[PDB]
PDB file of all heavy atoms in Angstrom:
ATOM      1  N   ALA W   1     115.001 -40.138 -38.794  1.00 11.76           N
ATOM      2  CA  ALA W   1     116.259 -40.913 -38.940  1.00 11.76           C
ATOM      3  C   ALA W   1     116.473 -41.427 -40.376  1.00 11.76           C
ATOM      4  O   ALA W   1     117.617 -41.520 -40.864  1.00 11.76           O
ATOM      5  CB  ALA W   1     116.296 -42.054 -37.944  1.00 11.76           C
ATOM      6  N   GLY W   2     115.373 -41.716 -41.064  1.00 10.69           N
ATOM      7  CA  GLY W   2     115.426 -42.209 -42.443  1.00 10.69           C
ATOM      8  C   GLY W   2     115.223 -41.141 -43.502  1.00 10.69           C
ATOM      9  O   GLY W   2     115.381 -39.943 -43.234  1.00 10.69           O
ATOM     10  N   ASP W   3     114.860 -41.582 -44.704  1.00 11.16           N
ATOM     11  CA  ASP W   3     114.766 -40.701 -45.882  1.00 11.16           C
ATOM     12  C   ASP W   3     113.351 -40.276 -46.231  1.00 11.16           C
ATOM     13  O   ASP W   3     113.154 -39.407 -47.097  1.00 11.16           O
ATOM     14  CB  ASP W   3     115.362 -41.380 -47.109  1.00 11.16           C
ATOM     15  CG  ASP W   3     116.824 -41.641 -46.962  1.00 11.16           C
ATOM     16  OD1 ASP W   3     117.511 -40.800 -46.338  1.00 11.16           O
ATOM     17  OD2 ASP W   3     117.275 -42.687 -47.476  1.00 11.16           O
ATOM     18  N   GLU W   4     112.369 -40.902 -45.594  1.00  8.18           N
ATOM     19  CA  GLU W   4     110.980 -40.532 -45.822  1.00  8.18           C
ATOM     20  C   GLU W   4     110.363 -39.970 -44.529  1.00  8.18           C
ATOM     21  O   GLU W   4     111.036 -39.899 -43.485  1.00  8.18           O
ATOM     22  CB  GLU W   4     110.194 -41.713 -46.427  1.00  8.18           C
ATOM     23  CG  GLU W   4     110.741 -42.210 -47.782  1.00  8.18           C
ATOM     24  CD  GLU W   4     110.505 -41.226 -48.942  1.00  8.18           C
ATOM     25  OE1 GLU W   4     109.378 -40.688 -49.062  1.00  8.18           O
ATOM     26  OE2 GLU W   4     111.440 -40.998 -49.752  1.00  8.18           O
ATOM     27  N   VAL W   5     109.113 -39.518 -44.616  1.00  7.25           N
ATOM     28  CA  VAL W   5     108.434 -38.862 -43.499  1.00  7.25           C
ATOM     29  C   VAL W   5     107.017 -39.417 -43.380  1.00  7.25           C
ATOM     30  O   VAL W   5     106.241 -39.371 -44.348  1.00  7.25           O
ATOM     31  CB  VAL W   5     108.360 -37.329 -43.742  1.00  7.25           C
ATOM     32  CG1 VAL W   5     107.620 -36.601 -42.620  1.00  7.25           C
ATOM     33  CG2 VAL W   5     109.752 -36.743 -43.926  1.00  7.25           C
ATOM     34  N   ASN W   6     106.690 -39.942 -42.202  1.00  4.89           N
ATOM     35  CA  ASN W   6     105.328 -40.309 -41.873  1.00  4.89           C
ATOM     36  C   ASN W   6     104.647 -39.072 -41.306  1.00  4.89           C
ATOM     37  O   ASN W   6     104.814 -38.739 -40.129  1.00  4.89           O
ATOM     38  CB  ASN W   6     105.309 -41.459 -40.858  1.00  4.89           C
ATOM     39  CG  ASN W   6     103.920 -42.036 -40.649  1.00  4.89           C
ATOM     40  OD1 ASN W   6     102.911 -41.308 -40.590  1.00  4.89           O
ATOM     41  ND2 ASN W   6     103.852 -43.361 -40.530  1.00  4.89           N
ATOM     42  N   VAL W   7     103.889 -38.390 -42.156  1.00  8.02           N
ATOM     43  CA  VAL W   7     103.303 -37.100 -41.823  1.00  8.02           C
ATOM     44  C   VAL W   7     102.344 -37.207 -40.651  1.00  8.02           C
ATOM     45  O   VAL W   7     102.370 -36.369 -39.738  1.00  8.02           O
ATOM     46  CB  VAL W   7     102.595 -36.494 -43.059  1.00  8.02           C
ATOM     47  CG1 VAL W   7     101.713 -35.319 -42.658  1.00  8.02           C
ATOM     48  CG2 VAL W   7     103.637 -36.045 -44.075  1.00  8.02           C
ATOM     49  N   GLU W   8     101.500 -38.241 -40.678  1.00 10.27           N
ATOM     50  CA  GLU W   8     100.477 -38.404 -39.663  1.00 10.27           C
ATOM     51  C   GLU W   8     101.103 -38.645 -38.300  1.00 10.27           C
ATOM     52  O   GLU W   8     100.593 -38.157 -37.291  1.00 10.27           O
ATOM     53  CB  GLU W   8      99.526 -39.552 -40.024  1.00 10.27           C
ATOM     54  CG  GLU W   8      98.676 -39.271 -41.256  1.00 10.27           C
ATOM     55  CD  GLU W   8      99.431 -39.472 -42.561  1.00 10.27           C
ATOM     56  OE1 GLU W   8     100.519 -40.117 -42.574  1.00 10.27           O
ATOM     57  OE2 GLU W   8      98.925 -38.979 -43.590  1.00 10.27           O
ATOM     58  N   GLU W   9     102.204 -39.394 -38.280  1.00  9.44           N
ATOM     59  CA  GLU W   9     102.913 -39.675 -37.036  1.00  9.44           C
ATOM     60  C   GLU W   9     103.599 -38.430 -36.494  1.00  9.44           C
ATOM     61  O   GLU W   9     103.551 -38.179 -35.290  1.00  9.44           O
ATOM     62  CB  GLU W   9     103.940 -40.780 -37.231  1.00  9.44           C
ATOM     63  CG  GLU W   9     103.321 -42.170 -37.272  1.00  9.44           C
ATOM     64  CD  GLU W   9     104.371 -43.262 -37.274  1.00  9.44           C
ATOM     65  OE1 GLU W   9     105.575 -42.932 -37.314  1.00  9.44           O
ATOM     66  OE2 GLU W   9     103.988 -44.452 -37.245  1.00  9.44           O
ATOM     67  N   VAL W  10     104.267 -37.673 -37.369  1.00 10.30           N
ATOM     68  CA  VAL W  10     104.910 -36.427 -36.947  1.00 10.30           C
ATOM     69  C   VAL W  10     103.871 -35.447 -36.389  1.00 10.30           C
ATOM     70  O   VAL W  10     104.063 -34.872 -35.300  1.00 10.30           O
ATOM     71  CB  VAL W  10     105.750 -35.781 -38.068  1.00 10.30           C
ATOM     72  CG1 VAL W  10     106.287 -34.425 -37.605  1.00 10.30           C
ATOM     73  CG2 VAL W  10     106.907 -36.706 -38.459  1.00 10.30           C
ATOM     74  N   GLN W  11     102.754 -35.293 -37.105  1.00  9.55           N
ATOM     75  CA  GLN W  11     101.692 -34.390 -36.637  1.00  9.55           C
ATOM     76  C   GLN W  11     101.134 -34.835 -35.272  1.00  9.55           C
ATOM     77  O   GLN W  11     100.873 -34.005 -34.398  1.00  9.55           O
ATOM     78  CB  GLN W  11     100.573 -34.330 -37.665  1.00  9.55           C
ATOM     79  CG  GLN W  11      99.531 -33.262 -37.365  1.00  9.55           C
ATOM     80  CD  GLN W  11      98.608 -33.041 -38.541  1.00  9.55           C
ATOM     81  OE1 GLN W  11      98.904 -33.432 -39.673  1.00  9.55           O
ATOM     82  NE2 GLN W  11      97.487 -32.420 -38.284  1.00  9.55           N
ATOM     83  N   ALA W  12     100.951 -36.144 -35.102  1.00  6.06           N
ATOM     84  CA  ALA W  12     100.419 -36.689 -33.852  1.00  6.06           C
ATOM     85  C   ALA W  12     101.343 -36.409 -32.663  1.00  6.06           C
ATOM     86  O   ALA W  12     100.872 -36.029 -31.589  1.00  6.06           O
ATOM     87  CB  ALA W  12     100.157 -38.181 -33.975  1.00  6.06           C
ATOM     88  N   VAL W  13     102.644 -36.587 -32.867  1.00  6.22           N
ATOM     89  CA  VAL W  13     103.638 -36.342 -31.819  1.00  6.22           C
ATOM     90  C   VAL W  13     103.697 -34.840 -31.482  1.00  6.22           C
ATOM     91  O   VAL W  13     103.745 -34.450 -30.304  1.00  6.22           O
ATOM     92  CB  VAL W  13     105.010 -36.926 -32.246  1.00  6.22           C
ATOM     93  CG1 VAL W  13     106.150 -36.395 -31.397  1.00  6.22           C
ATOM     94  CG2 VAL W  13     104.956 -38.457 -32.191  1.00  6.22           C
ATOM     95  N   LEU W  14     103.660 -33.994 -32.507  1.00  4.34           N
ATOM     96  CA  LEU W  14     103.652 -32.544 -32.258  1.00  4.34           C
ATOM     97  C   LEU W  14     102.402 -32.130 -31.485  1.00  4.34           C
ATOM     98  O   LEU W  14     102.485 -31.411 -30.478  1.00  4.34           O
ATOM     99  CB  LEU W  14     103.779 -31.761 -33.565  1.00  4.34           C
ATOM    100  CG  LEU W  14     105.136 -31.765 -34.249  1.00  4.34           C
ATOM    101  CD1 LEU W  14     104.974 -31.311 -35.697  1.00  4.34           C
ATOM    102  CD2 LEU W  14     106.138 -30.873 -33.509  1.00  4.34           C
ATOM    103  N   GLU W  15     101.243 -32.599 -31.937  1.00  3.05           N
ATOM    104  CA  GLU W  15      99.983 -32.354 -31.229  1.00  3.05           C
ATOM    105  C   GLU W  15     100.044 -32.811 -29.758  1.00  3.05           C
ATOM    106  O   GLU W  15      99.555 -32.119 -28.872  1.00  3.05           O
ATOM    107  CB  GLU W  15      98.834 -33.041 -31.981  1.00  3.05           C
ATOM    108  CG  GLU W  15      97.446 -32.843 -31.382  1.00  3.05           C
ATOM    109  CD  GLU W  15      96.527 -31.965 -32.230  1.00  3.05           C
ATOM    110  OE1 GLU W  15      96.850 -31.660 -33.403  1.00  3.05           O
ATOM    111  OE2 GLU W  15      95.452 -31.573 -31.711  1.00  3.05           O
ATOM    112  N   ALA W  16     100.663 -33.965 -29.505  1.00  2.42           N
ATOM    113  CA  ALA W  16     100.703 -34.564 -28.169  1.00  2.42           C
ATOM    114  C   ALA W  16     101.588 -33.821 -27.171  1.00  2.42           C
ATOM    115  O   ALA W  16     101.387 -33.952 -25.959  1.00  2.42           O
ATOM    116  CB  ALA W  16     101.131 -36.024 -28.253  1.00  2.42           C
ATOM    117  N   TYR W  17     102.580 -33.074 -27.652  1.00  3.94           N
ATOM    118  CA  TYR W  17     103.383 -32.251 -26.732  1.00  3.94           C
ATOM    119  C   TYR W  17     102.506 -31.130 -26.157  1.00  3.94           C
ATOM    120  O   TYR W  17     101.969 -30.304 -26.906  1.00  3.94           O
ATOM    121  CB  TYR W  17     104.655 -31.676 -27.423  1.00  3.94           C
ATOM    122  CG  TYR W  17     105.289 -30.555 -26.630  1.00  3.94           C
ATOM    123  CD1 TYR W  17     105.795 -30.788 -25.354  1.00  3.94           C
ATOM    124  CD2 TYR W  17     105.353 -29.252 -27.142  1.00  3.94           C
ATOM    125  CE1 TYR W  17     106.365 -29.760 -24.607  1.00  3.94           C
ATOM    126  CE2 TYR W  17     105.912 -28.220 -26.396  1.00  3.94           C
ATOM    127  CZ  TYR W  17     106.421 -28.486 -25.133  1.00  3.94           C
ATOM    128  OH  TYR W  17     106.979 -27.485 -24.361  1.00  3.94           O
ATOM    129  N   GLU W  18     102.355 -31.093 -24.835  1.00  2.51           N
ATOM    130  CA  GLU W  18     101.559 -30.025 -24.217  1.00  2.51           C
ATOM    131  C   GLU W  18     102.467 -28.823 -24.011  1.00  2.51           C
ATOM    132  O   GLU W  18     103.435 -28.899 -23.262  1.00  2.51           O
ATOM    133  CB  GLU W  18     100.993 -30.466 -22.879  1.00  2.51           C
ATOM    134  CG  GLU W  18      99.794 -31.400 -22.964  1.00  2.51           C
ATOM    135  CD  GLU W  18      99.359 -31.858 -21.577  1.00  2.51           C
ATOM    136  OE1 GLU W  18      99.152 -30.995 -20.683  1.00  2.51           O
ATOM    137  OE2 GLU W  18      99.262 -33.084 -21.371  1.00  2.51           O
ATOM    138  N   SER W  19     102.179 -27.727 -24.697  1.00  2.93           N
ATOM    139  CA  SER W  19     103.043 -26.545 -24.606  1.00  2.93           C
ATOM    140  C   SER W  19     103.334 -26.147 -23.153  1.00  2.93           C
ATOM    141  O   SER W  19     102.421 -25.950 -22.359  1.00  2.93           O
ATOM    142  CB  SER W  19     102.406 -25.374 -25.341  1.00  2.93           C
ATOM    143  OG  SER W  19     103.200 -24.193 -25.197  1.00  2.93           O
ATOM    144  N   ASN W  20     104.611 -26.031 -22.821  1.00  2.07           N
ATOM    145  CA  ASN W  20     105.002 -25.581 -21.500  1.00  2.07           C
ATOM    146  C   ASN W  20     105.881 -24.345 -21.679  1.00  2.07           C
ATOM    147  O   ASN W  20     107.043 -24.450 -22.083  1.00  2.07           O
ATOM    148  CB  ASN W  20     105.717 -26.699 -20.738  1.00  2.07           C
ATOM    149  CG  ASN W  20     106.239 -26.233 -19.400  1.00  2.07           C
ATOM    150  OD1 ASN W  20     106.150 -25.051 -19.073  1.00  2.07           O
ATOM    151  ND2 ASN W  20     106.793 -27.143 -18.625  1.00  2.07           N
ATOM    152  N   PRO W  21     105.321 -23.151 -21.417  1.00  2.00           N
ATOM    153  CA  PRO W  21     106.061 -21.920 -21.742  1.00  2.00           C
ATOM    154  C   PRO W  21     107.480 -21.821 -21.161  1.00  2.00           C
ATOM    155  O   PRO W  21     108.364 -21.208 -21.787  1.00  2.00           O
ATOM    156  CB  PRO W  21     105.160 -20.809 -21.185  1.00  2.00           C
ATOM    157  CG  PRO W  21     103.788 -21.401 -21.209  1.00  2.00           C
ATOM    158  CD  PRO W  21     103.963 -22.866 -20.914  1.00  2.00           C
ATOM    159  N   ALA W  22     107.715 -22.414 -19.990  1.00  2.00           N
ATOM    160  CA  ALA W  22     109.042 -22.368 -19.383  1.00  2.00           C
ATOM    161  C   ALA W  22     110.097 -23.015 -20.279  1.00  2.00           C
ATOM    162  O   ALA W  22     111.247 -22.567 -20.320  1.00  2.00           O
ATOM    163  CB  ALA W  22     109.026 -23.036 -18.012  1.00  2.00           C
ATOM    164  N   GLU W  23     109.693 -24.060 -21.009  1.00  2.00           N
ATOM    165  CA  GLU W  23     110.625 -24.822 -21.850  1.00  2.00           C
ATOM    166  C   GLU W  23     111.048 -24.096 -23.122  1.00  2.00           C
ATOM    167  O   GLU W  23     112.113 -24.404 -23.685  1.00  2.00           O
ATOM    168  CB  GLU W  23     110.024 -26.168 -22.212  1.00  2.00           C
ATOM    169  CG  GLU W  23     109.760 -27.006 -20.971  1.00  2.00           C
ATOM    170  CD  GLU W  23     109.020 -28.299 -21.251  1.00  2.00           C
ATOM    171  OE1 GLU W  23     108.554 -28.500 -22.389  1.00  2.00           O
ATOM    172  OE2 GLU W  23     108.910 -29.116 -20.311  1.00  2.00           O
ATOM    173  N   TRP W  24     110.217 -23.161 -23.584  1.00  2.00           N
ATOM    174  CA  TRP W  24     110.522 -22.458 -24.834  1.00  2.00           C
ATOM    175  C   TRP W  24     110.697 -20.963 -24.726  1.00  2.00           C
ATOM    176  O   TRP W  24     110.932 -20.287 -25.729  1.00  2.00           O
ATOM    177  CB  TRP W  24     109.534 -22.857 -25.947  1.00  2.00           C
ATOM    178  CG  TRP W  24     108.067 -22.733 -25.606  1.00  2.00           C
ATOM    179  CD1 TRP W  24     107.170 -23.757 -25.334  1.00  2.00           C
ATOM    180  CD2 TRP W  24     107.263 -21.503 -25.574  1.00  2.00           C
ATOM    181  NE1 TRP W  24     105.915 -23.258 -25.099  1.00  2.00           N
ATOM    182  CE2 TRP W  24     105.904 -21.912 -25.229  1.00  2.00           C
ATOM    183  CE3 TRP W  24     107.538 -20.149 -25.749  1.00  2.00           C
ATOM    184  CZ2 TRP W  24     104.866 -20.990 -25.088  1.00  2.00           C
ATOM    185  CZ3 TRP W  24     106.492 -19.226 -25.607  1.00  2.00           C
ATOM    186  CH2 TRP W  24     105.192 -19.637 -25.277  1.00  2.00           C
ATOM    187  N   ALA W  25     110.650 -20.434 -23.502  1.00  2.00           N
ATOM    188  CA  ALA W  25     110.857 -19.002 -23.285  1.00  2.00           C
ATOM    189  C   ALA W  25     112.151 -18.463 -23.920  1.00  2.00           C
ATOM    190  O   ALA W  25     112.162 -17.365 -24.482  1.00  2.00           O
ATOM    191  CB  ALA W  25     110.818 -18.685 -21.800  1.00  2.00           C
ATOM    192  N   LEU W  26     113.216 -19.258 -23.860  1.00  2.40           N
ATOM    193  CA  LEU W  26     114.517 -18.910 -24.449  1.00  2.40           C
ATOM    194  C   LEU W  26     114.412 -18.543 -25.923  1.00  2.40           C
ATOM    195  O   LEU W  26     115.175 -17.692 -26.409  1.00  2.40           O
ATOM    196  CB  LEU W  26     115.516 -20.070 -24.292  1.00  2.40           C
ATOM    197  CG  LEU W  26     116.904 -19.890 -24.914  1.00  2.40           C
ATOM    198  CD1 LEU W  26     117.694 -18.791 -24.200  1.00  2.40           C
ATOM    199  CD2 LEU W  26     117.674 -21.210 -24.931  1.00  2.40           C
ATOM    200  N   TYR W  27     113.481 -19.188 -26.631  1.00  2.12           N
ATOM    201  CA  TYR W  27     113.340 -18.984 -28.073  1.00  2.12           C
ATOM    202  C   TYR W  27     112.303 -17.953 -28.446  1.00  2.12           C
ATOM    203  O   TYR W  27     112.255 -17.534 -29.603  1.00  2.12           O
ATOM    204  CB  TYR W  27     113.000 -20.308 -28.782  1.00  2.12           C
ATOM    205  CG  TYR W  27     113.892 -21.427 -28.341  1.00  2.12           C
ATOM    206  CD1 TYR W  27     113.403 -22.430 -27.507  1.00  2.12           C
ATOM    207  CD2 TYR W  27     115.232 -21.484 -28.756  1.00  2.12           C
ATOM    208  CE1 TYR W  27     114.214 -23.458 -27.077  1.00  2.12           C
ATOM    209  CE2 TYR W  27     116.052 -22.515 -28.336  1.00  2.12           C
ATOM    210  CZ  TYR W  27     115.528 -23.504 -27.506  1.00  2.12           C
ATOM    211  OH  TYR W  27     116.309 -24.551 -27.084  1.00  2.12           O
ATOM    212  N   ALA W  28     111.522 -17.502 -27.472  1.00  3.35           N
ATOM    213  CA  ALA W  28     110.362 -16.676 -27.753  1.00  3.35           C
ATOM    214  C   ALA W  28     110.762 -15.195 -27.792  1.00  3.35           C
ATOM    215  O   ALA W  28     110.392 -14.409 -26.928  1.00  3.35           O
ATOM    216  CB  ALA W  28     109.268 -16.937 -26.742  1.00  3.35           C
ATOM    217  N   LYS W  29     111.546 -14.834 -28.798  1.00  6.01           N
ATOM    218  CA  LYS W  29     112.073 -13.473 -28.900  1.00  6.01           C
ATOM    219  C   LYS W  29     111.260 -12.724 -29.925  1.00  6.01           C
ATOM    220  O   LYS W  29     111.311 -13.056 -31.100  1.00  6.01           O
ATOM    221  CB  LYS W  29     113.543 -13.494 -29.332  1.00  6.01           C
ATOM    222  CG  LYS W  29     114.451 -14.312 -28.421  1.00  6.01           C
ATOM    223  CD  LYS W  29     115.883 -14.277 -28.943  1.00  6.01           C
ATOM    224  CE  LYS W  29     116.722 -15.413 -28.367  1.00  6.01           C
ATOM    225  NZ  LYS W  29     116.882 -15.369 -26.870  1.00  6.01           N
ATOM    226  N   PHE W  30     110.510 -11.725 -29.469  1.00  3.82           N
ATOM    227  CA  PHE W  30     109.614 -10.961 -30.344  1.00  3.82           C
ATOM    228  C   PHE W  30     110.281  -9.711 -30.924  1.00  3.82           C
ATOM    229  O   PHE W  30     111.212  -9.157 -30.330  1.00  3.82           O
ATOM    230  CB  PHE W  30     108.360 -10.507 -29.587  1.00  3.82           C
ATOM    231  CG  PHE W  30     107.356 -11.600 -29.323  1.00  3.82           C
ATOM    232  CD1 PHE W  30     107.603 -12.574 -28.369  1.00  3.82           C
ATOM    233  CD2 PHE W  30     106.140 -11.630 -30.020  1.00  3.82           C
ATOM    234  CE1 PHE W  30     106.671 -13.573 -28.117  1.00  3.82           C
ATOM    235  CE2 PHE W  30     105.202 -12.621 -29.758  1.00  3.82           C
ATOM    236  CZ  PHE W  30     105.466 -13.588 -28.806  1.00  3.82           C
ATOM    237  N   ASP W  31     109.779  -9.274 -32.078  1.00  2.00           N
ATOM    238  CA  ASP W  31     110.099  -7.952 -32.653  1.00  2.00           C
ATOM    239  C   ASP W  31     108.828  -7.116 -32.656  1.00  2.00           C
ATOM    240  O   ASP W  31     107.753  -7.639 -32.866  1.00  2.00           O
ATOM    241  CB  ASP W  31     110.607  -8.106 -34.079  1.00  2.00           C
ATOM    242  CG  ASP W  31     111.020  -6.789 -34.697  1.00  2.00           C
ATOM    243  OD1 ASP W  31     112.146  -6.343 -34.392  1.00  2.00           O
ATOM    244  OD2 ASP W  31     110.231  -6.238 -35.488  1.00  2.00           O
ATOM    245  N   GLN W  32     108.947  -5.812 -32.425  1.00  2.00           N
ATOM    246  CA  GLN W  32     107.750  -4.971 -32.355  1.00  2.00           C
ATOM    247  C   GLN W  32     106.989  -4.920 -33.688  1.00  2.00           C
ATOM    248  O   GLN W  32     105.770  -4.832 -33.689  1.00  2.00           O
ATOM    249  CB  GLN W  32     108.109  -3.553 -31.904  1.00  2.00           C
ATOM    250  CG  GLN W  32     106.900  -2.651 -31.690  1.00  2.00           C
ATOM    251  CD  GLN W  32     107.291  -1.230 -31.337  1.00  2.00           C
ATOM    252  OE1 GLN W  32     108.389  -0.986 -30.841  1.00  2.00           O
ATOM    253  NE2 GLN W  32     106.396  -0.274 -31.617  1.00  2.00           N
ATOM    254  N   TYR W  33     107.709  -5.022 -34.805  1.00  2.00           N
ATOM    255  CA  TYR W  33     107.148  -4.675 -36.116  1.00  2.00           C
ATOM    256  C   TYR W  33     106.723  -5.852 -36.976  1.00  2.00           C
ATOM    257  O   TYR W  33     105.836  -5.709 -37.823  1.00  2.00           O
ATOM    258  CB  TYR W  33     108.137  -3.825 -36.897  1.00  2.00           C
ATOM    259  CG  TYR W  33     108.567  -2.622 -36.099  1.00  2.00           C
ATOM    260  CD1 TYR W  33     109.823  -2.585 -35.495  1.00  2.00           C
ATOM    261  CD2 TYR W  33     107.701  -1.540 -35.921  1.00  2.00           C
ATOM    262  CE1 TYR W  33     110.218  -1.494 -34.734  1.00  2.00           C
ATOM    263  CE2 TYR W  33     108.081  -0.441 -35.167  1.00  2.00           C
ATOM    264  CZ  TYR W  33     109.347  -0.432 -34.575  1.00  2.00           C
ATOM    265  OH  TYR W  33     109.743   0.652 -33.823  1.00  2.00           O
ATOM    266  N   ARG W  34     107.355  -7.004 -36.795  1.00  2.00           N
ATOM    267  CA  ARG W  34     106.917  -8.173 -37.558  1.00  2.00           C
ATOM    268  C   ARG W  34     107.175  -9.462 -36.804  1.00  2.00           C
ATOM    269  O   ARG W  34     107.842  -9.462 -35.770  1.00  2.00           O
ATOM    270  CB  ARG W  34     107.612  -8.228 -38.926  1.00  2.00           C
ATOM    271  CG  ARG W  34     109.119  -8.271 -38.843  1.00  2.00           C
ATOM    272  CD  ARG W  34     109.697  -8.973 -40.056  1.00  2.00           C
ATOM    273  NE  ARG W  34     109.360 -10.396 -40.063  1.00  2.00           N
ATOM    274  CZ  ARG W  34     109.668 -11.216 -41.061  1.00  2.00           C
ATOM    275  NH1 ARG W  34     110.332 -10.751 -42.119  1.00  2.00           N
ATOM    276  NH2 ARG W  34     109.315 -12.495 -41.000  1.00  2.00           N
ATOM    277  N   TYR W  35     106.657 -10.561 -37.327  1.00  2.00           N
ATOM    278  CA  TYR W  35     106.918 -11.857 -36.685  1.00  2.00           C
ATOM    279  C   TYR W  35     108.384 -12.289 -36.843  1.00  2.00           C
ATOM    280  O   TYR W  35     109.051 -11.924 -37.818  1.00  2.00           O
ATOM    281  CB  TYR W  35     105.951 -12.932 -37.192  1.00  2.00           C
ATOM    282  CG  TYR W  35     106.247 -13.481 -38.563  1.00  2.00           C
ATOM    283  CD1 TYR W  35     107.027 -14.637 -38.720  1.00  2.00           C
ATOM    284  CD2 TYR W  35     105.736 -12.871 -39.701  1.00  2.00           C
ATOM    285  CE1 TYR W  35     107.292 -15.154 -39.981  1.00  2.00           C
ATOM    286  CE2 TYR W  35     106.001 -13.385 -40.974  1.00  2.00           C
ATOM    287  CZ  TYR W  35     106.768 -14.523 -41.104  1.00  2.00           C
ATOM    288  OH  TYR W  35     107.033 -15.038 -42.357  1.00  2.00           O
ATOM    289  N   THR W  36     108.866 -13.082 -35.889  1.00  2.00           N
ATOM    290  CA  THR W  36     110.257 -13.513 -35.890  1.00  2.00           C
ATOM    291  C   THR W  36     110.356 -15.016 -36.009  1.00  2.00           C
ATOM    292  O   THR W  36     109.431 -15.732 -35.588  1.00  2.00           O
ATOM    293  CB  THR W  36     110.982 -13.059 -34.625  1.00  2.00           C
ATOM    294  OG1 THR W  36     110.315 -13.574 -33.472  1.00  2.00           O
ATOM    295  CG2 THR W  36     111.026 -11.509 -34.548  1.00  2.00           C
ATOM    296  N   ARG W  37     111.461 -15.482 -36.588  1.00  2.00           N
ATOM    297  CA  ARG W  37     111.748 -16.911 -36.755  1.00  2.00           C
ATOM    298  C   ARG W  37     112.975 -17.267 -35.919  1.00  2.00           C
ATOM    299  O   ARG W  37     114.051 -16.704 -36.124  1.00  2.00           O
ATOM    300  CB  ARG W  37     112.048 -17.228 -38.227  1.00  2.00           C
ATOM    301  CG  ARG W  37     111.009 -16.730 -39.222  1.00  2.00           C
ATOM    302  CD  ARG W  37     111.331 -17.235 -40.635  1.00  2.00           C
ATOM    303  NE  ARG W  37     110.150 -17.189 -41.493  1.00  2.00           N
ATOM    304  CZ  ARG W  37     109.294 -18.198 -41.641  1.00  2.00           C
ATOM    305  NH1 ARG W  37     109.500 -19.346 -41.011  1.00  2.00           N
ATOM    306  NH2 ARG W  37     108.231 -18.064 -42.420  1.00  2.00           N
ATOM    307  N   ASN W  38     112.813 -18.214 -34.994  1.00  2.00           N
ATOM    308  CA  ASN W  38     113.824 -18.505 -33.987  1.00  2.00           C
ATOM    309  C   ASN W  38     114.186 -19.966 -34.040  1.00  2.00           C
ATOM    310  O   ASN W  38     113.399 -20.810 -33.634  1.00  2.00           O
ATOM    311  CB  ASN W  38     113.280 -18.120 -32.595  1.00  2.00           C
ATOM    312  CG  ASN W  38     112.908 -16.645 -32.517  1.00  2.00           C
ATOM    313  OD1 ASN W  38     113.777 -15.775 -32.342  1.00  2.00           O
ATOM    314  ND2 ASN W  38     111.624 -16.345 -32.717  1.00  2.00           N
ATOM    315  N   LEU W  39     115.372 -20.261 -34.564  1.00  2.00           N
ATOM    316  CA  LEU W  39     115.823 -21.638 -34.759  1.00  2.00           C
ATOM    317  C   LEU W  39     116.049 -22.350 -33.431  1.00  2.00           C
ATOM    318  O   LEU W  39     116.716 -21.810 -32.532  1.00  2.00           O
ATOM    319  CB  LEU W  39     117.108 -21.673 -35.611  1.00  2.00           C
ATOM    320  CG  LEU W  39     117.566 -23.032 -36.166  1.00  2.00           C
ATOM    321  CD1 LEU W  39     116.514 -23.713 -37.034  1.00  2.00           C
ATOM    322  CD2 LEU W  39     118.849 -22.813 -36.971  1.00  2.00           C
ATOM    323  N   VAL W  40     115.477 -23.553 -33.319  1.00  2.00           N
ATOM    324  CA  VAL W  40     115.550 -24.366 -32.106  1.00  2.00           C
ATOM    325  C   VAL W  40     116.441 -25.587 -32.307  1.00  2.00           C
ATOM    326  O   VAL W  40     117.282 -25.909 -31.446  1.00  2.00           O
ATOM    327  CB  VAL W  40     114.143 -24.842 -31.654  1.00  2.00           C
ATOM    328  CG1 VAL W  40     114.231 -25.745 -30.415  1.00  2.00           C
ATOM    329  CG2 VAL W  40     113.227 -23.652 -31.354  1.00  2.00           C
ATOM    330  N   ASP W  41     116.250 -26.268 -33.434  1.00  2.00           N
ATOM    331  CA  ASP W  41     117.013 -27.483 -33.736  1.00  2.00           C
ATOM    332  C   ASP W  41     117.191 -27.644 -35.234  1.00  2.00           C
ATOM    333  O   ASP W  41     116.274 -27.340 -35.997  1.00  2.00           O
ATOM    334  CB  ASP W  41     116.251 -28.693 -33.196  1.00  2.00           C
ATOM    335  CG  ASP W  41     117.109 -29.933 -33.111  1.00  2.00           C
ATOM    336  OD1 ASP W  41     117.914 -30.046 -32.162  1.00  2.00           O
ATOM    337  OD2 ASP W  41     116.935 -30.802 -33.977  1.00  2.00           O
ATOM    338  N   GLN W  42     118.363 -28.153 -35.666  1.00  2.00           N
ATOM    339  CA  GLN W  42     118.607 -28.370 -37.106  1.00  2.00           C
ATOM    340  C   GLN W  42     118.440 -29.805 -37.582  1.00  2.00           C
ATOM    341  O   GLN W  42     118.780 -30.127 -38.725  1.00  2.00           O
ATOM    342  CB  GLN W  42     119.992 -27.869 -37.503  1.00  2.00           C
ATOM    343  CG  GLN W  42     120.051 -26.368 -37.568  1.00  2.00           C
ATOM    344  CD  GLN W  42     121.428 -25.849 -37.913  1.00  2.00           C
ATOM    345  OE1 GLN W  42     122.432 -26.220 -37.290  1.00  2.00           O
ATOM    346  NE2 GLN W  42     121.482 -24.960 -38.887  1.00  2.00           N
ATOM    347  N   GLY W  43     117.918 -30.652 -36.707  1.00  2.00           N
ATOM    348  CA  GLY W  43     117.448 -31.976 -37.067  1.00  2.00           C
ATOM    349  C   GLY W  43     118.489 -32.849 -37.729  1.00  2.00           C
ATOM    350  O   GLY W  43     118.144 -33.662 -38.578  1.00  2.00           O
TER     351      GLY W  43
END
């Protein structure tokens, strides 16, 4: 929300989310030949 970033807090929150494949299947679009980048949110 602000202009700075608490790195340790952001990392902790990301770590704490337990991956649930059903929630991100929509974004998990693979290419046979290389890795893909799939935008989820623009923050």
